[PDB]
Amino acid sequence: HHWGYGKHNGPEHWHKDFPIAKGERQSPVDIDTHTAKYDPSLKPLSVSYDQATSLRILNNGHAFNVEFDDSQDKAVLKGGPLDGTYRLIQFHFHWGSLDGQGSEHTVDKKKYAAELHLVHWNTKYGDFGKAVQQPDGLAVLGIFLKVGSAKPGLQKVVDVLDSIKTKGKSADFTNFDPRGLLPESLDYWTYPGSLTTPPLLECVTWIVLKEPISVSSEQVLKFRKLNFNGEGEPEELMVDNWRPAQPLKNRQIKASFK
Numbered sequence: 738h739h740w741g742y743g744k745h746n747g748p749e750h751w752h753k754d755f756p757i758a759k760g761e762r763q764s765p766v767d768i769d770t771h772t773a774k775y776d777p778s779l780k781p782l783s784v785s786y787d788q789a790t791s792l793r794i795l796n797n798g799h800a801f802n803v804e805f806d807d808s809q810d811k812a813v814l815k816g817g818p819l820d821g822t823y824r825l826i827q828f829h830f831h832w833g834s835l836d837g838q839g840s841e842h843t844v845d846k847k848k849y850a851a852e853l854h855l856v857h858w859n860t861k862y863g864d865f866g867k868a869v870q871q872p873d874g875l876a877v878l879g880i881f882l883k884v885g886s887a888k889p890g891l892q893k894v895v896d897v898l899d900s901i902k903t904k905g906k907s908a909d910f911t912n913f914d915p916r917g918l919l920p921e922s923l924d925y926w927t928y929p930g931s932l933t934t935p936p937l938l939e940c941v942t943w944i945v946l947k948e949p950i951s952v953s954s955e956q957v958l959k960f961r962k963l964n965f966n967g968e969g970e971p972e973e974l975m976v977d978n979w980r981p982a983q984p985l986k987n988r989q990i991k992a993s994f995k
């Protein structure tokens with residue numbers, strides 16, 4: 738009876754195994770756009786993905802992760818609110834059963850259809866497992882998805898999902914360019930928070946882009962055909978794998994833009 742997204746093991750249960758669920762810097766949060774303060778000291782975000790080396794895609798029973806070779810400074814995030822250099826390790830999404838929900842962060846209580854998380858670790862801690870033990874260990878770039886026009890750069894991901902339907906399945910996934918998942922603008926909000934899944938560690942500088950990407954209904958429908966279950970187990974569609982907004986508590990959300 739491990740954690741998941743169901744009635745009996747979903748977000749409102751997580752605190753029993755992971756008491757930090759009720760902590761002081763939990764994610765996601767609602768971004769109140771009128772209360773977020775423009776911070777002229779914030780730098781433009783530097784996203785350097787030209788040499789990114791994707792390796793594999795994995796259904797881990799909660800989402801799918803596109804994994805990267807993070808054994809050298811290839812795909813890195815810096816600037817913005819960050820000090821130092823953060824290396825891309827994986828991206829994944831959260832999405833809904835319907836287009837009206839699925840995002841983890843909300844904007845003035847608006848829920849997007851899905852949310853992309855590009856996860857990076859601070860190179861000053863040497864590895865991901867050490868980084869998650871630190872308050873500045875991770876930088877997660879969050880990008881909202883709305884349903885409209887197709888995102889051509891997403892289609893390579895959508896088309897491999899058939900091969901990783903069920904929990905524990907993986908597939909080679911080389912030469913995928915995550916630049917094709919970015920919106921035009923790098924305007925963002927930022928705040929200190931946490932992982933949004935167990936172990937819910939309070940190790941993340943969140944950077945949430947203002948501009949959503951558009952994906953087609955067909956693209957998101959393919960996400961919703963994935964399974965939380967393993968092969969030859971009762972089919973449970975992988976949908977609604979998002980944690981709701983958590984209390985902001987003693988935090989300020991800062992905007993990079995006026």
Ligand SMILES: NS(=O)(=O)c1ccc(C(=O)N2CCc3ccccc3C2)cc1
Pocket residue numbers: 827854856866869877931932933934935936
């Ligand atoms: N949704 S999110 O906050 O962007 C998120 C980001 C990263 C992860 C993640 O890769 N994990 C959880 C922590 C951890 C710790 C030790 C070893 C492995 C892992 C694997 C899960 C969720």
Ligand SMILES: [Zn+2]
Pocket residue numbers: 829830831854933
């Ligand atoms: Zn996530």
